[PDB]
Ligand binder design. Structure first.
Ligand SMILES: Cc1onc(-c2ccccc2)c1NC(=O)NCc1ccccc1C(F)(F)F
Length: 296
């Protein structure tokens, strides 16, 4: 549902092939469970199962969503294995990402907090690796002419070996309620991540995702701090619309902050494409230690 453009293709899994272990989370629209899935990939593997709460309006939304998720298959997009429409509750099966959402991962590996990562805070090299993988996922989405209306570290997942992918199970509005401004009665906007054209003109395009990516880049270098944390929602709207930009994170080199600033050009057409933003961050991620040591 987070995607905006500009039933046979959907894979099906038998309910007996899914063995629920325990809950991982919950929202107003459903629950997420860790489960064992048999005969999915050649014997048994762990998966995250999203159970849809209750209905014919939601069932067609489920069908459209599964079709969209089937289309969206790439190295930095959370893997969607298919559905179980064999009775109720309707289930969506995703790969299991051991470290959970990227916001929680960053916070737990920040100065205010060992199989996959070293002790203490994440180094410059790993923060650049995290940013580059999120940018790669957006390059793929932009390439398919898709707009992600809620790009943020809470909407990214981290797996074994610090593999980062864009994806969520629709519970961010419940889990991270303060990251949204209620305009209601049932609408919540992620204003802190939204560009001026979204707030002022209610327009959201591929260029608006470049802005949101710039905010994601800032979350990463602040170890998951909320953008404009010092401000109420209306104060945040005032800053974004007046042109006040997020300040350089302590852990962020001037070279990386230059990438954030390029994402935050008031005029959409003036912002660099996600392709160029990814190219620059990837170069920095795979740059020799000698070069990286003199940046940070
Ligand atoms: C706000 C919201 O409400 N329901 C959902 C929802 C629906 C069905 C499956 C999971 C999540 C939702 N999230 C949402 O659409 N996220 C997009 C997403 C989710 C999983 C995998 C990939 C992706 C994508 F590539 F970024 F598009």
């Amino acid at each position: 549902s987070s995607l905006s453009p500009t039933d046979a293709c959907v894979h099906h899994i038998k309910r007996r092939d899914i063995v629920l272990k325990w809950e991982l989370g919950e929202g107003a629209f459903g629950k997420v469970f860790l489960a064992e899935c048999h005969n999915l990939l050649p014997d048994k593997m762990l998966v995250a199962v999203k159970a849809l709460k209750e209905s014919e309006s939601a069932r067609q939304d489920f069908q459209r969503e599964a079709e969209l998720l089937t289309m969206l298959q790439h190295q930095h997009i959370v893997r969607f294995f298919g559905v179980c429409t064999e009775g109720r509750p309707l289930l969506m099966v995703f790969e299991y990402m051991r470290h959970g959402d990227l916001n929680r991962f960053l916070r737990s590996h920040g100065p205010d907090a060992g199989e996959d990562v070293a002790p203490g805070p994440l180094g410059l090299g790993q923060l650049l690796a995290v940013a580059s993988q999120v940018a790669a996922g957006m390059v793929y989405l932009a390439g398919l002419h898709f707009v992600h209306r809620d790009l943020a570290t809470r909407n990214c997942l981290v797996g074994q070996g610090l593999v980062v992918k864009i994806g969520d199970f629709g519970m961010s509005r419940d889990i991270y309620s303060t990251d949204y401004y209620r305009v209601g009665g049932r609408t919540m906007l992620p204003i802190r991540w939204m560009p001026p054209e979204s707030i002022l003109y209610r327009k959201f395009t591929t260029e608006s995702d470049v802005w949101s990516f710039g905010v994601v880049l800032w979350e990463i270098f602040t170890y998951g701090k909320q953008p404009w944390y010092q401000l109420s929602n209306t104060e945040a709207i005032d800053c974004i619309t007046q042109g006040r930009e997020l300040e350089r994170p302590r852990a962020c080199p001037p070279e990386v902050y230059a990438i954030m600033r390029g994402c935050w050009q008031r005029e959409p057409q003036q912002r660099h494409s996600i392709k160029d933003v990814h190219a620059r961050l990837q170069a920095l991620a795979q740059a020799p230690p000698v070069y990286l040591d003199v940046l940070g």
